[PDB]
Write a protein that binds this ligand. Sequence first.
Ligand SMILES: CC(=O)N[C@@H]1[C@@H](OC(C)=O)[C@H](OC(C)=O)[C@@H](COC(C)=O)O[C@H]1n1cc(CN([C@@H](C(=O)O)C(C)C)S(=O)(=O)c2ccc(-c3ccccc3)cc2)nn1
Ligand SMILES: [Ca+2]
Ligand SMILES: [Ca+2]
Ligand SMILES: [Ca+2]
Ligand SMILES: [Zn+2]
Ligand SMILES: [Zn+2]
Length: 157
Amino acid sequence: PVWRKHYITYRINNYTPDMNREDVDYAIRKAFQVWSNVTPLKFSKINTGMADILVVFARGAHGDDHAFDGKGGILAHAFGPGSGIGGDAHFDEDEFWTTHSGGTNLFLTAVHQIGHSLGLGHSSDPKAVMFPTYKYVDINTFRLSADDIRGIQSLYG
Ligand SMILES: CC(=O)N[C@@H]1[C@@H](OC(C)=O)[C@H](OC(C)=O)[C@@H](COC(C)=O)O[C@H]1n1cc(CN([C@@H](C(=O)O)C(C)C)S(=O)(=O)c2ccc(-c3ccccc3)cc2)nn1
Ligand SMILES: [Ca+2]
Ligand SMILES: [Ca+2]
Ligand SMILES: [Ca+2]
Ligand SMILES: [Zn+2]
Ligand SMILES: [Zn+2]
């Protein structure tokens, strides 16, 4: 299933102490842009009320029956499109979130995760952002794969 709307709201539930807030805000917003640039979807940040996509930073057990696992291992996960917890993107706060390198990069992780929030599954092209394994790539040249674009457009046009 997909979202039945073109306007989709997200909300940052809380912030990681690893990065400054402006940078977290920029990486979430830019990561939505990636999907927004190749779809009819529009993504708007709300600061109050109930959003479609709740962005959470949390460690270990955090009340959705998919406890994180400490530093490394599971980096994030997000639920597919739906009511309540559907759409919500979670990031493991035991990781060290970074603007660029030398941690787990938030933008790239969030692009991938937003991808699952939107309904995508995994790709077999290593160049695809929806490829199963995290790996830092040059953000200056970051670009969606044809696999990613065919997929997202298969869902939303
Ligand atoms: C399959 C496997 O071997 N499992 C590894 C496990 O592997 C080995 C060899 O043991 C390993 O656990 C330990 C401790 O050994 C750990 C290794 O990775 C590290 C050190 O980061 O990860 C397990 N793992 C993770 C995930 C999937 N992820 C979730 C997701 O699909 O998004 C999902 C869980 C909801 S995700 O890892 O967190 C993930 C998050 C973000 C990204 C990404 C982000 C930006 C750009 C591209 C990709 C990629 C993956 N599947 N298996
Ligand atoms: Ca939700
Ligand atoms: Ca982890
Ligand atoms: Ca952290
Ligand atoms: Zn969770
Ligand atoms: Zn994934």
